[PDB]
Amino acid sequence: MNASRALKEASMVITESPAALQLRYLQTLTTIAAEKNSTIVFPLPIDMLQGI
Amino acid sequence: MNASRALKEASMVITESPAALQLRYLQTLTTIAAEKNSTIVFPLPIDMLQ
Amino acid sequence: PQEILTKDSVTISVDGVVYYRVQNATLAVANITNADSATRLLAQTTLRNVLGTKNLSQILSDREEIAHNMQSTLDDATDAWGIKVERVEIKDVKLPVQLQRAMAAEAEASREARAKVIAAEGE
Amino acid sequence: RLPDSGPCGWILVAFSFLFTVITFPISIWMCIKIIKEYERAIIFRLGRILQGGAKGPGLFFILPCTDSFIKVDMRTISFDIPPQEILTKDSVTISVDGVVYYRVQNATLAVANITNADSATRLLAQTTLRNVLGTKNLSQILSDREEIAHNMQSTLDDATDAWGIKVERVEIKDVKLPVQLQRAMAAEAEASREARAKVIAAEGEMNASRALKEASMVITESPAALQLRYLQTLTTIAAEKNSTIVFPLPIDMLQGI
Amino acid sequence: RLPDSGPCGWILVAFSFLFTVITFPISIWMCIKIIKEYERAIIFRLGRILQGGAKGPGLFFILPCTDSFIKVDMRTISFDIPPQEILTKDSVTISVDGVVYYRVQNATLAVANITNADSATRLLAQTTLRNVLGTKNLSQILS
Ligand code: NA
Ligand code: NA
């Protein structure tokens, strides 16, 4: 409950240029990769899959 | 039962803007990654513009 | 040290101390074979029993009540030996390693709640 | 305040007077006792305690046959308590490393009412510290020294009074969490630095964006250029010391089924 | 201020004088004391401290049979504290390695009011450092 207001404020800015959320997504991946754990990553060419 | 009221208040604020809940998801993932023996499988949808 | 079970069935090991004195030298010699050994074993069993009637949270909060309970048991037993037990106290308490992080959940959660507010401000 | 715990005497005393005088140049050294300003003496003669309080500083005479003599230091003493295992009110496992300061307040009780004043006092300090910290949350333990000290003092005074002891301080020199809890409990500090890092990272995205747009506008004029960039990325990744799995995928063969 | 802690005198002192004079070529080296500017002495005569404050620099005479002599260095001392494990206000585990500087400012109290002044001081420094850093966030500790 205490954290919710700031997340709403952040969301209202981010949605005005929605690709910003993908930038946040990619920075999350960089943070996770640094931890001492196994990470498996799948680059996925969706327009190639859209063809079949 | 005791926790439900606060979750409702948090939910009502979060759902007023669409990206907010997604930010909560990504922060959870960052919290998970610090625990031992936590494998994360991560898709990267990419467009080659054909 | 002793191995103990609480009322809520938590396994804990405790490390006690006892204080006592002779108050009737005639009974201490002629009514019991070894007054010191008898007293020290009685202290252990009395501590074992009382803590089994308490939840772990009560053990941390109810020193005065626990002391009052033990004294009645000790006085009834030690009168015939010419002994007065003055205190039984606990020096250490330990959880098994497998239980330690699980039981600490409230403290972990409180710091995690403050972290979330900081992180949301970052976003 | 006394502790809670004849004709033939003159014969023994006289025998002792005679014997010491008969042995004077040797035995007078045993008879003579000197007590310093900061010391006190408890003296028994034929088992009875000499009347009044503990004997003060100065020169004193005793007979080693009939008399027994105990000398008490009245100065403050400090002891380094062995480390302890403790549970907080919020059930956190911590180990603490204490120190206690204490002083003899009444020399008669310290001698004649307790078998070993030091060990009794040192054990009592440990159990009192164990109890008080069990009534506090971990955050309170770090913030509430004055309240914690006040709580302990009243407990200690009620017990040590009968022993003639005054405890002056109990303090902690180390506190440790077990290794499994250390990163979890540090969440608030870790989050603050990550929050500042995120702002720095977003400024980096903004600064780099213009050049990526310029690169994109050239690349899109012959879109197969992006596939060339894709293949050079794969070559870079394969050179790292990590596992790579590659799937050649004949899409026109899949298009047939 | 003082610490919170006759015929037989004359006779015993007189005996000591005679003994030391009879042993004069041996006694010279034990009965005479010299105190530097940066030192003070605490002297007990038959268990009673000599009147006034601690004895200053100079030449002094001690009857070893009746008298006890303690000299105190008044200069600054530095000590390398062993490392400690600490928790910050934000609950970060850190280990710190400290140093303390101190000096005696009243030689009478240092001798007669505490059993071991140095050990008491060094332990007190450790606990004081432990407490204060527990009231500070890690960023405040650095700044
Ligand atoms: Na200690
Ligand atoms: Na040091």
Q: How far is B3 from chain A (nearest CA, A)?
A: 11
Long-range contacts of D47-54 (CB under 8 A, 24+ apart): D49/D108, D49/D112, D53/D107, D53/D108, D54/D107, D54/D108
Ligand that lies nearest to the alpha carbon of residue E83, given by its number in the listed order: 2
- Alpha-carbon distance of A21 to A14, in angstroms, equals 7
Give the contacts of D41 (CB within 8 A, at least 6 positions apart).
Answer: D33, D35, D54, D55, D60, D69, D70, D71, D72, D107
In chain B, which residue's Cα lies nearest the Cα of C119?
B27
Task: HSE, CB side, 13 Å, CA atoms: give it for residue D25.
Answer: 1
**If we measure between CA atoms, which residue out of E63, E102, E101, E88 comes closest to residue E138?**
E88
Residues of chain B positioned with their CB less than 8 A from the CB of C119? 27
Pairwise CB contact (< 8 Å): A42 & B39:
no
Residues of chain C positioned with their CB less than 8 A from the CB of D120? 19
Pairwise CB contact (< 8 Å): E120 & D78:
yes
Residues of chain D positioned with their CB less than 8 A from the CB of C115? 187-188, 190-191
- Distance (angstroms) between ligand 2 centre and the Cα of C95 equals 33
Residues of chain B positioned with their CB less than 8 A from the CB of A46? 45-47
CB D67 within 8 A of CB D45: yes
Show the tokens assigned to A14: 């981010």
Residues of chain E positioned with their CB less than 8 A from the CB of D173? 84, 123, 126-127, 130
- Alpha-carbon distance of D150 to A19, in angstroms, equals 59
Task: Quote the DSSP letter at residue D245.
Answer: -
- Alpha-carbon distance of C10 to D110, in angstroms, equals 41
CB C91 within 8 A of CB C54: no
In chain B, which residue's Cα lies nearest the Cα of A51?
B50
DSSP letters for C97-109: HHHHHHHTHHHHH
Q: How far is C103 from chain A (nearest CA, A)?
A: 25
Q: According to DSSP H, which parts of A1-52 are helical?
A: 4-14, 20-33, 46-49
- Distance (angstroms) between ligand 1 centre and the Cα of C10 equals 29
- Distance (angstroms) between ligand 1 centre and the Cα of C104 equals 25
Strand partners, E115: none
| 3-state SS, one letter per residue, for chain B | CCCHHHHHHHHHHHCCCCHHHHHHHHHHHHHHHCCCCCCEEEEEEECCCC
- Alpha-carbon distance of E66 to D36, in angstroms, equals 12
Nearest CB to B40 within list A14, A18, A32: A32
- Alpha-carbon distance of D105 to D166, in angstroms, equals 6
The owner of tokens 């059930």 is D91
Q: What is the resolution of this structure in A?
A: 2.2
Give the contacts of C66 (CB within 8 A, at least 6 positions apart).
Answer: C50, C51, C54, C59
Pairwise CB contact (< 8 Å): D227 & B34:
no
Ligand that lies nearest to the alpha carbon of residue E95, given by its number in the listed order: 2
Residue B27 touches partner C, C-beta closer than 8 Å: yes
